[PDB]
Amino acid sequence: ATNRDQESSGFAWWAGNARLINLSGKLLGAHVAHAGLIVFWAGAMTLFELAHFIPEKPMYEQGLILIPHIATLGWGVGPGGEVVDTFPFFVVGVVHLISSAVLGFGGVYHAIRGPETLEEYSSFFGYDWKDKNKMTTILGFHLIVLGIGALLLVAKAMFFGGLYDTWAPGGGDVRVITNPTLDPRVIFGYLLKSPFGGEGWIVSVNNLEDVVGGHIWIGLICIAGGIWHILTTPFGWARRAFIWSGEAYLSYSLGALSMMGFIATCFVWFNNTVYPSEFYGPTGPEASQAQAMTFLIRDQKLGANVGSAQGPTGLGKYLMRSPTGEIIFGGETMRFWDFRGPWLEPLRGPNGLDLNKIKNDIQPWQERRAAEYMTHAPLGSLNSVGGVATEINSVNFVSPRSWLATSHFVLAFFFLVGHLWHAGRARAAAAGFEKGIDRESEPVLSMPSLD
Amino acid sequence: ANLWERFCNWVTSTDNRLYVGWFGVIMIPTLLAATICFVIAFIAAPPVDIDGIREPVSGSLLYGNNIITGAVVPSSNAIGLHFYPIWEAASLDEWLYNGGPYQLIIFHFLLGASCYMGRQWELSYRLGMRPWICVAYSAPLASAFAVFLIYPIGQGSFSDGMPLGISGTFNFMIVFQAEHNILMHPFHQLGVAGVFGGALFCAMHGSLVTSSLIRETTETESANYGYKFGQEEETYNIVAAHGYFGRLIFQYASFNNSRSLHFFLAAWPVVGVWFAALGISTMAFNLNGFNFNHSVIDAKGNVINTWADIINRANLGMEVMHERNAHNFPLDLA
Amino acid sequence: ERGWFDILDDWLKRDRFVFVGWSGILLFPCAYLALGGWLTGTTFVTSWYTHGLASSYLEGCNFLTVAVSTPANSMGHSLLLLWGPEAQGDFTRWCQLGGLWTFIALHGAFGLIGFMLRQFEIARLVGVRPYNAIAFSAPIAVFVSVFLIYPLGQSSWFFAPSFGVAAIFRFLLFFQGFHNWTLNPFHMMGVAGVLGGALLCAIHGATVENTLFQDGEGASTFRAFNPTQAEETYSMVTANRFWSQIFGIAFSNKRWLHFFMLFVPVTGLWMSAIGVVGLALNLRSYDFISQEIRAAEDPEFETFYTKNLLLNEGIRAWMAPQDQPHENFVFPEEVLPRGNAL
Amino acid sequence: AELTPEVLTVPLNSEGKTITLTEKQYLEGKRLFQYACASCHVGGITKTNPSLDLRTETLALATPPRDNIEGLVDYMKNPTTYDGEQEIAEVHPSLRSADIFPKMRNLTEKDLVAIAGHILVEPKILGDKWGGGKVYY
Amino acid sequence: METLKITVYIVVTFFVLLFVFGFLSGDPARNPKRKDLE
Amino acid sequence: TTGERPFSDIITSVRYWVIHSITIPALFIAGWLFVSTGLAYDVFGTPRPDSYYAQEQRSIPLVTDRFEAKQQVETFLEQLK
Ligand code: CLA
Ligand code: CLA
Ligand code: CLA
Ligand code: CLA
Ligand SMILES: CC1=C(/C=C/C(C)=C/C=C/C(C)=C/C=C/C=C(C)/C=C/C=C(C)/C=C/C2=C(C)CCCC2(C)C)C(C)(C)CCC1
Ligand SMILES: CC1=C(/C=C/C(C)=C/C=C/C(C)=C/C=C/C=C(C)/C=C/C=C(C)/C=C/C2=C(C)CCCC2(C)C)C(C)(C)CCC1
Ligand SMILES: CC1=C(/C=C/C(C)=C/C=C/C(C)=C/C=C/C=C(C)/C=C/C=C(C)/C=C/C2=C(C)CCCC2(C)C)C(C)(C)CCC1
Ligand SMILES: CCCCCCCCCCCCO[C@@H]1O[C@H](CO)[C@@H](O[C@H]2O[C@H](CO)[C@@H](O)[C@H](O)[C@H]2O)[C@H](O)[C@H]1O
Ligand SMILES: CCCCCCCS[C@@H]1O[C@H](CO)[C@@H](O)[C@H](O)[C@H]1O
Ligand SMILES: [Cl-]
Ligand SMILES: [Cl-]
Numbered sequence A: 001a002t003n004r005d006q007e008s009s010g011f012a013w014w015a016g017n018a019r020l021i022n023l024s025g026k027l028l029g030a031h032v033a034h035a036g037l038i039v040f041w042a043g044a045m046t047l048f049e050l051a052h053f054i055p056e057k058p059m060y061e062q063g064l065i066l067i068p069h070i071a072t073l074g075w076g077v078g079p080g081g082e083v084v085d086t087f088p089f090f091v092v093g094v095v096h097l098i099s100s101a102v103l104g105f106g107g108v109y110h111a112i113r114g115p116e117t118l119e120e121y122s123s124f125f126g127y128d129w130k131d132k133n134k135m136t137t138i139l140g141f142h143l144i145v146l147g148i149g150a151l152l153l154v155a156k157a158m159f160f161g162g163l164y165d166t167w168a169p170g171g172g173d174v175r176v177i178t179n180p181t182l183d184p185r186v187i188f189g190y191l192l193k194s195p196f197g198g199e200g201w202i203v204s205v206n207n208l209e210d211v212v213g214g215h216i217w218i219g220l221i222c223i224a225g226g227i228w229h230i231l232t233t234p235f236g237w238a239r240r241a242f243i244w245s246g247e248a249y250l251s252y253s254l255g256a257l258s259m260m261g262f263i264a265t266c267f268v269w270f271n272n273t274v275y276p277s278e279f280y281g282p283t284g285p286e287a288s289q290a291q292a293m294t295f296l297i298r299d300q301k302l303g304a305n306v307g308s309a310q311g312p313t314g315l316g317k318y319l320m321r322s323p324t325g326e327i328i329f330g331g332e333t334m335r336f337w338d339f340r341g342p343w344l345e346p347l348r349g350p351n352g353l354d355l356n357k358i359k360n361d362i363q364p365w366q367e368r369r370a371a372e373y374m375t376h377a378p379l380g381s382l383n384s385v386g387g388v389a390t391e392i393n394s395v396n397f398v399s400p401r402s403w404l405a406t407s408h409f410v411l412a413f414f415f416l417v418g419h420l421w422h423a424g425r426a427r428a429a430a431a432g433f434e435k436g437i438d439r440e441s442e443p444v445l446s447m448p449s450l451d
Numbered sequence B: 001a002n003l004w005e006r007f008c009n010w011v012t013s014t015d016n017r018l019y020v021g022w023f024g025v026i027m028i029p030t031l032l033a034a035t036i037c038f039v040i041a042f043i044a045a046p047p048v049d050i051d052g053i054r055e056p057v058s059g060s061l062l063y064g065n066n067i068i069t070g071a072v073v074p075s076s077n078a079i080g081l082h083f084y085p086i087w088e089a090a091s092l093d094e095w096l097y098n099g100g101p102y103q104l105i106i107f108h109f110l111l112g113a114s115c116y117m118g119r120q121w122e123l124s125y126r127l128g129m130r131p132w133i134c135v136a137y138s139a140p141l142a143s144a145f146a147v148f149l150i151y152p153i154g155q156g157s158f159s160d161g162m163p164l165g166i167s168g169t170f171n172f173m174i175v176f177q178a179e180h181n182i183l184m185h186p187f188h189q190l191g192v193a194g195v196f197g198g199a200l201f202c203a204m205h206g207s208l209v210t211s212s213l214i215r216e217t218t219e220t221e222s223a224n225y226g227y228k229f230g231q232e233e234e235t236y237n238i239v240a241a242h243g244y245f246g247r248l249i250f251q252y253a254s255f256n257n258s259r260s261l262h263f264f265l266a267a268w269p270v271v272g273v274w275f276a277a278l279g280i281s282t283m284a285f286n287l288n289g290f291n292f293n294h295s296v297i298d299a300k301g302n303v304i305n306t307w308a309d310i311i312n313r314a315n316l317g318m319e320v321m322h323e324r325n326a327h328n329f330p331l332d333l334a
Numbered sequence C: 001e002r003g004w005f006d007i008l009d010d011w012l013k014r015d016r017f018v019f020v021g022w023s024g025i026l027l028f029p030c031a032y033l034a035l036g037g038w039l040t041g042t043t044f045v046t047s048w049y050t051h052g053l054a055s056s057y058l059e060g061c062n063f064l065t066v067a068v069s070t071p072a073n074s075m076g077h078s079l080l081l082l083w084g085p086e087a088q089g090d091f092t093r094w095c096q097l098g099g100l101w102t103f104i105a106l107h108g109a110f111g112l113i114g115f116m117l118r119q120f121e122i123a124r125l126v127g128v129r130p131y132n133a134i135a136f137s138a139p140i141a142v143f144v145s146v147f148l149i150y151p152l153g154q155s156s157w158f159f160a161p162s163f164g165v166a167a168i169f170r171f172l173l174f175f176q177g178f179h180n181w182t183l184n185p186f187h188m189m190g191v192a193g194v195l196g197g198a199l200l201c202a203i204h205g206a207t208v209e210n211t212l213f214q215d216g217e218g219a220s221t222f223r224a225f226n227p228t229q230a231e232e233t234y235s236m237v238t239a240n241r242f243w244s245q246i247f248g249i250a251f252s253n254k255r256w257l258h259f260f261m262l263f264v265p266v267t268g269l270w271m272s273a274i275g276v277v278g279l280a281l282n283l284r285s286y287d288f289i290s291q292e293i294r295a296a297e298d299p300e301f302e303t304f305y306t307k308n309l310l311l312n313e314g315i316r317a318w319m320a321p322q323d324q325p326h327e328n329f330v331f332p333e334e335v336l337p338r339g340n341a342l
Numbered sequence D: 001a002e003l004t005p006e007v008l009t010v011p012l013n014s015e016g017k018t019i020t021l022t023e024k025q026y027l028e029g030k031r032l033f034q035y036a037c038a039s040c041h042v043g044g045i046t047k048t049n050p051s052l053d054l055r056t057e058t059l060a061l062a063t064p065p066r067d068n069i070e071g072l073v074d075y076m077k078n079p080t081t082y083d084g085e086q087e088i089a090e091v092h093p094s095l096r097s098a099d100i101f102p103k104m105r106n107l108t109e110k111d112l113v114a115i116a117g118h119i120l121v122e123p124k125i126l127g128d129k130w131g132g133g134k135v136y137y
Numbered sequence E: 001m002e003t004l005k006i007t008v009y010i011v012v013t014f015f016v017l018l019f020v021f022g023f024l025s026g027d028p029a030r031n032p033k034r035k036d037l038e
Numbered sequence F: 001t002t003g004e005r006p007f008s009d010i011i012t013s014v015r016y017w018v019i020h021s022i023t024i025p026a027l028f029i030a031g032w033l034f035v036s037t038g039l040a041y042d043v044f045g046t047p048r049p050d051s052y053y054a055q056e057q058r059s060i061p062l063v064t065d066r067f068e069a070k071q072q073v074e075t076f077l078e079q080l081k
């Protein structure tokens, strides 16, 4: 039992995985076994979702999070997001589940049977955390892998049947992307957009050409970065800025994953392009807009002149102006005027919502969609009672958008905490005081008093 | 040494009465801006159209508030999540009507308080301490993020951010209860266990150490003089304190390890408050408290109320009265 | 000299797994019966006849919604003794009338006395000062103020808190809508003591753990402490410098620090109790008269204070008919206060 | 109180005939109403048009009359405005519009009868709560 | 307003550059024990 | 150490489980039957699902007389059948 108690390792059982820091073979096993757990869940969860799936109800009425990801890639769906074939969902689930066995086998082998350190076995596979060149090499390999993955998305969208396009002319449908956006002014433009209202940084991406083009760039950037990191060693200024240890590296990645988690939370909460509402349900903004649309339609059918109808406050009951003058829906949904969606855009003119289009061009499909979205707003209880907090039991619904945003907030948050924990510890360990202050060399005792 | 070197040495100096540091370089200006704006606004700001319905709410002392009713009022619902710096207004009069001070204050504050957390790491490093005080501070900090940034993001407006004021705070609480049934949410329940338990353990620790202070003084002086700053010897008898507490309950329910005790004292409130913060941050995306409305039904199908249904009636009161001129349509969807 | 009193005293004070003591004679039966009564009621007992509510696992409630609910308003402040004039010895009827509520509240009260006596008794035996008992006066003041004094000022025990998770939540919301209790400076002092206590708990624990001396080779640092060691396990001097530099002030005296940790939450609780004693009499901090004079005369004048009272008016109108069934309130749809649409 | 055969006896048609639903039919009706209808009609109201509810007295005054099994079954096939004047299948779930309201695709005639029975039975149980909205929660 | 915007932009950039260059200025070595962390 | 046998000795002993493999399931079953036989409803006066209201009644049987409360509850119970 090498390094598998507190007396030999210096780490208690509850920090037992820290016993692995310098045991590259066993740590490889932990990592590969873990990847197995991730892949297992993707596989198992998909098959559970498929088993539980009723094709003629919306996905979002059924507690699905994975089938919607598969559908968004253009698999299993047709016009409007209707399910035309569940077999692609079965395939994805099965292949992930099978693959997990392989990862679990490798993981278990390296963890309990293989060489506990890799360095005397292989100069290629072994590593010292403190060897800057080998760390950038392995980083480089993994960048190449990630770039190939981004190009897989590109290949799916351009060469293997397309992606689900909620914006497709004449109604959402799977569409092949033939003209991905390559112009770096557009692609990198998203990156410099404000994250505030009406701008929304990268989360505002609203067409598949930009999405695909973005992955072309990312894939090429990542492959190039990987080659770069294989072929170079960190420069002097980077050597002086960072802590070079396994725990430090963990810390940096925790920081990064935290940031990505908060971004993902915002993506699924606001974005209805890469998270089509057909699969994920309406966004919060979308459903609030849909309510105003619903009652505008109803009251106008009854004879209301909706442009001229003054509400209790003096603002338009149905229609008002945004702070820059655009015609928008009124009531509290004034906050959501930056919302855009395919059911609403046909009513939009150069100056915003167009009164003549409103009076004459609203189609029954738009009424249906607005009613659907108003009544599947992402509000609901922890026990999955759909609606406002005061609603009675009846409807079993919590939007996938709420599940995905809340879970990823929680996870991003604790990952920030882990970043702080491990970055602070990495620092202290590198400097030599992570176990406490030396009684005979207490630094404050050598400093002048403050007063 | 050159100027930059000298400057860096001063910024990171362990000898400044108040530590500056690199975090402090951002913290100091942002906190001062937030503070100065808050003070001036709390005193002298005119009414603010919080709900975007041209119904301005007076928050300042000079416009008829006392300390309890006063506030800096959230930015207008018309603005939503848009960024409203001074320079996006046609004039300061407009900026004021629309609740511009709120955004300036909360953004400078959240940046500054984040740097306060970083600064706690930074000084711990300069002094050769262990690094995790900042992690305990992440709990109140996360909570401030939840009420000033995350909740607005989820609901689509800074108008739904917690107001900067005492009564404003209560308004935020009552409306949150109406809209999310927070009392019935297990993360707020963990938060309560966190602060009631933090208070309990605070009193308990204080009382047990105070119980066991070693006699070093006479009856006509404060026992506090029995401890001298920086003495090597512990000032209470932990063996006696454990002897006491272990009999109060039973032996193995009491800590005889000071490190383990002090870790528990940190962890209990911090973890509970992290769940409080996560409660607010997840109700931000309308995953709400448990809903047992009409969960109990008799053999015929008559509803048999429980205490959940009574809560529901209170919540309804809040819901139907809040922002009484702002809703035109039947459902409050954000 | 060597009599039965002294012999019993010997036995009561043996050093055993669970200490008994003279205080035990009061504490153990009272605590057991309060806890047992709660578990019995939440598991099996209704609130149909007292409140019109289901309140037990038996009827289909969960851990959050079960309660032992207060007696009907018509019982007034009856002790509701099993052998009393209401139940007349009938255990079933006693349960249906809410006898378990007074059972739990009164055995609980005597149990708390017993617990505080235990704190004194043990302190005396071990030879420590009785500050833990002193600190426990806060929980006693809260229990007595909220569970006994409050309903005693009101019409009946009906309006005390019912012993239940959701039932306690209802009690909070009642206090907002009817008493505007958030506005009360005694509650505010409560809040500050509880949150302040939680703050002190967090910050003291973290400070000790982050100023530890290196007293072992282990990276997990708990084993480097020995209960019998003479020396401080952490550096007060480094802790003091850190806080002086971060926050501007810092503790320098460990006895003061730990006293303050008693004082803050104990004082907070005691203040909150004083407020609740005023609420027993409806002696609220409900209003600011100056605000009301202005608002009545000036329909453009609005503060967060006025907004909250509108919420309160909603709470009262919407909750009263079901929350106060003995009043037989019928509020026609048309009288219910509502804003636009909702 | 019990869910008796009497509670479960509702008008079949406008001509005085009734039908006594089984307990299984009542349960199916609840399940199916939740499945296909409750997103808008929870508790007997109508979220996208609160002026029209599912109260029996309201249904009686609809044209043609909807306060019986036949009227409700017909409504689910070919819904109309309250005055009978317009056919609204294009914006209201129906068998006729099962193409655009896909949850209607699996509903059988038996299922429509069950949903209809639920709409008629529930106010017999719940009184003013049925179609009452939040006031009566 | 344009002048204010530019002034604030310049102020913010100044402080952000101090933060970044400052942490780039041998920060790991600014501790009381082991400085050769590069 | 206070004289009693360590718990960890007790619960890892065979004799403890010989005893408790009987007494634990015996108690659990007795509790089960307390409910399943209906005895619990009778002991505590808790309504069964069919006993909250008479068939056509939609008024709560609230106790309104302190000293006649026992008789009121009894009259309420008579009204069910
Ligand atoms: C994803 C979670 C995860 C993973 C992958 C690991 C991985 C590892 N941990 Mg860690 N650990 C974890 C969570 C995890 N840990 C948690 C939650 C705790 C706290 C309880 C610990 C506490 C802990 C301690 C205290 C120690 C470790 C150690 C280790 C390593 C050696 C284990 C060993 O010797 O087993 C011995 C056990 C067995 C031989 C029993 C069987 C174990 C196998 C793997 C079960 C596999 C079952 C699976 C279904 C088989 C499928 C096969 C199929 C595909 C063919 C190993 C690399 C040790 C170490 O660091 O060594 C240097 C060590 O001392 N861990
Ligand atoms: C990141 C994952 C990873 C890494 C770095 C390693 C590293 C190593 N493994 Mg392990 N192993 C893994 C995963 C991994 N393994 C998995 C998943 C399994 C289960 C099948 C195994 C099962 C395993 C066994 C049984 C043995 C090893 C051994 C070894 C060593 C020699 C490897 C070699 O010579 O191959 C040289 C190269 C080849 C043989 C050609 C590579 C062929 C692969 C299949 C190409 C696939 C590429 C593709 C991009 C992968 C995509 C994966 C993605 C979809 C998840 C080396 C330390 C040996 C050892 O430790 O000796 C004592 C040994 O006996 N490994
Ligand atoms: C996981 C991916 C990854 C990781 C961990 C690294 C890590 C590293 N790279 Mg590499 N690199 C990558 C991918 C990555 N690289 C890719 C894809 C490319 C191709 C573009 C490169 C190209 C590259 C070059 C050309 C160089 C590095 C260098 C380095 C080193 C220093 C990095 C540094 O100081 O960052 C921190 C960044 C800074 C200090 C820059 C200023 C900080 C600004 C103000 C940050 C503002 C962003 C903010 C948080 C907001 C986010 C949103 C934003 C997009 C607007 C380090 C070993 C350096 C090196 O030593 O090479 C040998 C170097 O010269 N890398
Ligand atoms: C220290 C232990 C203790 C304490 C302080 C209490 C306290 C109480 N119990 Mg509890 N109880 C206990 C143990 C205790 N109990 C135990 C062990 C059981 C299980 C048997 C119970 C079961 C129980 C039930 C079922 C009920 C009570 C109730 C009560 C309350 C009224 C008691 C009363 O009026 O007594 C009056 C009696 C005395 C105070 C004793 C005085 C003795 C004097 C000093 C001697 C004189 C005696 C005299 C010679 C007798 C001659 C009379 C003759 C002429 C006919 C009170 C809160 C009631 C309650 O809570 O209602 C809501 C109630 O219904 N208790
Ligand atoms: C190291 C370690 C650990 C961990 C481990 C792990 C993490 C592992 C993993 C593992 C894994 C990760 C595994 C996996 C496996 C898998 C499998 C075994 C699979 C199978 C499959 C199948 C069999 C299929 C089937 C089918 C089909 C084909 C179709 C449909 C139907 C069905 C589903 C039936 C622990 C913590 C314990 C601690 C100690 C050490
Ligand atoms: C795909 C896609 C796209 C694109 C994408 C891209 C193009 C991206 C990019 C990205 C990027 C390009 C990113 C970057 C990032 C960065 C970062 C994140 C940084 C960091 C930094 C740090 C962390 C630092 C630190 C420090 C300092 C500050 C100094 C001193 C010291 C130290 C070093 C520590 C779009 C949107 C179009 C559409 C959709 C899809
Ligand atoms: C009242 C009364 C009395 C008494 C009674 C008694 C004394 C009772 C007791 C009772 C009891 C004594 C009961 C108990 C019960 C229990 C239960 C019912 C439990 C439950 C539990 C649970 C459910 C748990 C859970 C868990 C765990 C285990 C761990 C962690 C997690 C959790 C928390 C989940 C007398 C006769 C004198 C008189 C008349 C009246
Ligand atoms: C996307 C953006 C692309 C940016 C590309 C360029 C990369 C950024 C390079 C930053 C270079 C800064 O380089 C850094 O400068 C500072 C300032 O003098 C140096 O100077 C510092 O040296 C020592 C280091 O122990 C300190 O004690 C001293 O106070 C300071 O003068 C650092 O030792 C040097 O490493
Ligand atoms: C890594 C395993 C991936 C397996 C690849 C399956 C092809 S995917 C396939 O591609 C076809 C065109 O060739 C499209 O017409 C079709 O829509 C699409 O599903
Ligand atoms: Cl309000
Ligand atoms: Cl509205």
Ligand SMILES: [Cl-]
Binding pocket: none
């Ligand atoms: Cl009506």
Ligand SMILES: [Fe+2]
Binding pocket: B205, B209, B262, C204, C208, C258
């Ligand atoms: Fe302490």
